[PDB]
Design a protein around this ligand. Structure first.
Ligand code: E6K
Ligand code: E6K
Ligand code: FBP
Ligand code: FBP
Ligand code: FBP
Ligand code: FBP
Ligand code: OXL
Ligand code: OXL
Ligand code: OXL
Ligand code: OXL
Ligand code: K
Ligand code: K
Ligand code: K
Ligand code: K
Ligand code: MG
Ligand code: MG
Ligand code: MG
Ligand code: MG
Lengths: 419, 436, 424, 424
């Protein structure tokens, strides 16, 4: 069998490793999102179209470099490249825009960060990667600088030093997610300890059900070379096996000679590594650790993921306003793709932070009866799923919906046979 | 602690001290045993059905009303004794006692009628007396047949043929009573609706010290197959003459439930003994304590690991509903069912939540007592013009009956299992509902 | 051979889940190992004859219980003399001699604190060299201290097994177990003191906690009750015996079945037959894993050697673990890990040989030879005595692997060596 | 006792976790490694690392195995490198605290069958007393047989580590491992022969299968590649080293990093620092459980003793397992169960002392005292030599517990004894 299914059926983690097969081809869509830093080498609309086709899901703009005018032009070019595919709604791929802050430097929230965060709100950025977060009050300051109009921007705290690692729990509690910012972390703490901080933070984020990004020097040699080193491919695969929701490219896409090839390489490795995940142990441990809950979205999500594993469901189609119902499905790490049908263009972009969530932006005419409108949003997930290769006639899918309109009312799971 | 901290704050520490919940949260079976607490009171409705043999001591309509209130779910008529006239009178008395509670549809308790055959004796196949008794069963509308001395698949085919075209809906529970039945167990279970571990004959046919191995193996295989299994004979034997059982008898009843038995049975204890109602009350009291002591964490994990992948939407919905019920400590899983099958597939995963099965079939309401944790509710209203409205009314009937009987309280979460179109075989929906 | 792997429920032993283990239990898979759960038989008019006691020893009785709720001191002194005469009638064949413990079961406090009758009975016990006290109605740690004080300076070596018979004993279980040598789940009184339908919860909890503590636990009362008057037990009775062994009980007991009934020998034979079947049905894969996980780290060399020896025995399907012991402690530490291999304990202490019957899977052998001049030769002779005893009794055959547990110097407390030996 | 500080070091809070997810969540950058680094470092000797003075610094930095790549250089060039390694190694014979055996490994050029150059280079290896051959491009069992035949009458004791470098070697892995002493995951060629994104699958599979077989596995190529020109590695490189150790690799390797790079000593220091951190982060609770479950039952006393000793070491947090070995086999069987305790292997064979560096966690001590007339005294002298070396090196202190593994008679193949000692 394909997608490492012989290794998936193993009774121990050791036997699972023994059964990994280089000839077992991945079939599932690539789950781990790729964040590519946009810079001189990846700014043109033509280059950005190739990066989107190669697998870029989130465009990062590093406000440690360039200027407001430079980054606004990169943002406009990203949006032009993304919207060039909107003419085919069944295959359109949303792409998030993330602003990475310069940071506090010596000393709270710097004056440059206040201005850059305001720029982010004015330019409709989806995510903020907040540099050098070392305590909960740093997150509150970033949130306050985003103001009343930036209530919906996701804050991903970058852990870059010893204090951030030690105060991790309080930082994660108030953040939307975390970035393991290994460049500074590898200079702030001994280089030989970074893997411990990475594995601990990824594990704690997986436990919390919040997105975690692995970043910096993942494919470093590809800045000048067309192929990566053996350590670099291993690093990408191990970040996925660790449980990372996203993987990142910095100089590799911002200034390197092979930006598209770096994205293609992360896509190819992530897909292989996702199939090599030992779901039998991972699901059991995530399910045991996820606390008991009376929230119906929480209850429906675990029921849906259990049902998907029982029938080898090709996908879990979920309707979501904010992305939350898709995020609660993603936290259980289903092998089934989570196809999230949303009308919110911002939620479609932001949900790339959660592993295995494939956002579909709904642009079909509304139905007069709310129940019919729900059914056509589900048929839209099915038709997009068929076109993209997620679904085929005869497949089983799990459909997750709610009892009334508006966010917070997901409570239904259905088993549906395709076509 | 972190996996139950928020729910402990919401439901309270008292909730998590009842129904052996501290033992339920243990990380190992050894720790689970260490945490069993005699002060942790059972809260859930008793899920293992009680089969009471009806005879001289339990025949009157007045006595039968007391036995139904004490917990009898299935009335057994042993065709090894009495006659057709005697058993028909017992059946009429059971039906009169059962129907005396029909005036209140929101509290009515269905009771199944089971015919236990005399058996083949020294003959190789279906005896002439069994052919006549099986025909009596069909004519008197019995729900279940406990077929004596089943030794191979062809024995069950002969019982099925003797029930004729009008008895296709009767459940056949094969009684394993000898070495051959144990050795050919897999082929017998494949063609039967369920099994009875008939320990009286089994304990004479094989060494007495080996019966527990056969009992535990057959219960385990039935649990794996998702088919009902009954533990029978001498469970509370001393209660035929004494008001209280022995220490070995209470232990035996508790261990049959912990083994995984769907039903427990009383023979002479209810048929001829001096304390028929007290014997039913004792099995009810022990079964509730034992059900709470089941280590669901390992049982659910092992039932998932051993059960193969399934493309049947009823099976897929059932596992998702049981998983959802455990996540929120659901008070109940309400399921709509025509034949009982959707309730049976929920029961095979052994949820702690009561499975409230709403059905229009009076026979399916009686037969689902064979499946552990299924509480049948007979819906008597005529169909609504719009099918979706009819479905909704049946779910609301389950909620209202649940509140009236004490299964459900305001603020509870319930899991509701329904299908996408009318008719049997289309269950595919699981909903999480808050009781208001 | 392939036949080896079909016996003693070995197909069920290899299962990956407890559910599949149950599914693989086979009534045709015959038990091979020696019966490891000890049988306690209460002595009375049905079992007091010296000749009848010889039959009970041959049937499998390991511990004779004297119930001091019935009979005078004169009655119990005669019981002790009769038991000792029957036991010593087999001493002429040292390779097959079976030690038998004598346990004094107290009348209890009644309406009162240690009663004055219990003080007198406990002093009688010390004067007559009883090995174990089954202390009735233990409700708290101070009840155990009072029993220990009544045994005096000469009774320090007597084991105290606290009987849990009421709600207070169950609630104060942890403090009682801490100061006791072991526990008895005294189901007769327990089933009247608490609701009858709750006794199984108290039994399973106390057995589980004693298994975790590595201390002996006895399941008692009405196990084969109908055999007081009938030749065969009920289906519930055989199930109760099998389930007490599967629960983890070190010992099972007979009261009226051996003291006053018409089938004392048959009741012992029935418990022996059931216990042997149930021991093979134990899912050692999960049990060993959980006993290891729950047991804390230890710096005591006897315990460290014991876990290593039990792990080694499982690795090679060892026929036995032969251990030399002065007090029984090295054998008890092996027993707490529940090896499938029989623990053959060789000792010179007649009292330790009798007391180790409290620990499941310990087969005591009383060595009577005076010490060799060279200590290493004395140890070897005792190990060879264990091997010769085991071959004669059917525990061992040529070609079997055994684990041998000894210490680095004479005297108690110095066990620290485990060795893999081929039987020649 | 041990103290609270003891339980905060070497990732012991993460070690006690009940799940792998909880284990990851408990990894702590402030929990310092205490145990000696157990993953051997292989350094390729070339232009940048040839001088006797540079080799002394590489030995102090942690190099355990010197690799001579016969794809380059010549017989004269590599003989001079080997003589320089031996001079640097023997310069530490004046201090037991710094003297460490260093293996010499010959890596072949590679291949219709065995190339003429490989026949001559393998002959050079035998003539120069090499310990190990890393055989390039092994694709099937007959490739190993050809290398084994070329090692001739004098070199049958040389270990053959088959390098898996292409699709065929991965597909025929089981047959290759069966006849090889171990494996090298040769990622350079493997990453060109198969898609680059699949190398991690082949690495993890081969390491897992070698761990199951109890045979050494090496992770190789581009582990710290950027350190050829830079003083510090990339974040991907440190992660790659840590993950090779967490995967289960017995050895990690440096090629161009030490052969031609500007920072050979720093590359060795970096691998030592990472390996030590990664070894403490291994989740032994699951690893030991799975190695035990997957390993078949065994009647070999060395195998039975090894699992018992590793279980005993975990029970007491033993500072070390001291094993007497002539071939290295008894130490290899301890290593296969991945104890946290260091395996201190005392041997009179200088070749076995160098070769046991292939097995994770084995610390070789070459013993050179003349044999005692009384064999038990010769065994005791070697056990005490292991203890006194352990004390001098920082492995052991007075009051520590150690597990000691020996056999019942002299000669290889008789290991059957495990003892718990207490350091005095
Ligand atoms: O901080 C350190 O020491 C670590 C290295 C950080 C850099 N990583 S990056 O992918 O964000 C990046 C971002 C940028 C550039 C990079 O070359 C680069 O590698 C530019 O040349 C550029 C030039 C004009 C305007 C904007 C940019 C720009 O945004
Ligand atoms: O693509 C390939 O097949 C080649 C990849 C490089 C191989 N790596 S190595 O660490 O074994 C190594 C080995 C050597 C050298 C290396 O520079 C080098 O990186 C030399 O300059 C040298 C020069 C004179 C005599 C001997 C050597 C020598 O032994
Ligand atoms: O994931 P979220 O943000 O809670 O959104 C889920 C919501 O989407 C729905 O499925 C559809 O709601 P809308 O019709 O308002 O889009 C609701 O029933 C449910 O509450
Ligand atoms: O358990 P069964 O026998 O499959 O019955 C379940 C059936 O009951 C329903 O929920 C309701 O069906 P009806 O309206 O025919 O009673 C169906 O949608 C479903 O297929
Ligand atoms: O189990 P215990 O009471 O600690 O006895 C074990 C003792 O028995 C021995 O094996 C033999 O000791 P003796 O020669 O004194 O009988 C000692 O080495 C060891 O300390
Ligand atoms: O690991 P190996 O090569 O089998 O060597 C183990 C041998 O070492 C010993 O412990 C000591 O033997 P020697 O005295 O011959 O060195 C033997 O008892 C044992 O058989
Ligand atoms: O800021 C970052 O991305 C880093 O330091 O790795
Ligand atoms: O038939 C029965 O019920 C039996 O034998 O137990
Ligand atoms: O004392 C006892 O043995 C009892 O009450 O069971
Ligand atoms: O030969 C090697 O070492 C390689 O290819 O990695
Ligand atoms: K930045
Ligand atoms: K009958
Ligand atoms: K008494
Ligand atoms: K080479
Ligand atoms: Mg940074
Ligand atoms: Mg019968
Ligand atoms: Mg009593
Ligand atoms: Mg190569």
């Amino acid at each position: 069998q394909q997608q490492q299914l012989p290794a998936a059926m193993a009774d121990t983690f050791l036997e699972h490793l023994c059964l990994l097969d280089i000839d077992s081809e991945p079939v599932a869509a690539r789950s781990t999102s790729i964040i590519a830093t946009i810079g001189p080498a990846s700014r043109s609309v033509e280059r950005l179209k190739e990066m989107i086709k190669a697998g870029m899901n989130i465009a990062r703009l590093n406000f440690s470099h360039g200027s407001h005018e430079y980054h606004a032009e990169s943002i406009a070019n990203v949006r032009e490249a993304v919207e060039s595919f909107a003419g085919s709604p069944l295959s359109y791929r949303p792409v998030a825009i993330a602003l990475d802050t310069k940071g506090p430097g010596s000393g709270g929230l710097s004056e440059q960060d206040v201005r850059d965060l305001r720029f982010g709100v004015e330019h409709g950025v989806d995510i903020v990667f907040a540099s050098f977060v070392r305590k909960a009050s740093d997150v509150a300051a970033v949130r306050a600088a985003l103001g009343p109009e930036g209530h919906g921007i996701k804050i991903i705290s970058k852990i870059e030093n010893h204090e951030g690692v030690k105060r991790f729990d309080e930082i994660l509690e108030v953040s939307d997610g975390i970035m393991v910012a290994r460049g500074d972390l590898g200079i702030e703490i001994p280089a030989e300890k970074v893997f411990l901080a990475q594995k601990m933070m990824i594990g704690r984020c997986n436990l919390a059900g919040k997105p975690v990004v692995c970043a910096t020097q993942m494919l470093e040699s590809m800045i000048t070379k067309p192929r990566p080193t053996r350590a670099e491919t291993s690093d990408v695969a191990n970040a996925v096996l660790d449980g990372a929701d996203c993987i990142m490219l910095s100089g590799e896409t911002a200034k390197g000679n092979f930006p598209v090839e770096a994205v293609k390489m992360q896509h190819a490795i992530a897909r292989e590594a996702e199939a090599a995940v030992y779901h039998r142990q991972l699901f059991e441990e995530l399910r045991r650790a996820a606390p008991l809950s009376r929230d119906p979205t929480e209850v429906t999500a675990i029921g849906a993921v259990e049902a998907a594993f029982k029938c080898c469901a090709a996908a879990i189609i979920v309707l979501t306003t904010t992305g939350r119902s898709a995020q609660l499905l993603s936290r259980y790490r289903p092998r089934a793709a989570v196809i999230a049908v949303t009308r919110s263009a911002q939620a479609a972009r932001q949900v790339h932070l959660c592993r295995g969530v494939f956002p579909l932006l709904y642009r079909e005419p509304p139905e007069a009866i709310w129940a019919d409108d729900v059914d056509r949003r589900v048929q839209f997930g099915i038709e997009s799923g068929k076109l993209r290769g997620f679904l085929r006639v005869g497949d089983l899918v799990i459909v997750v919906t709610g009892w009334r309109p508006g966010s917070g009312y997901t409570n239904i799971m259905r088993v549906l046979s395709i076509s």
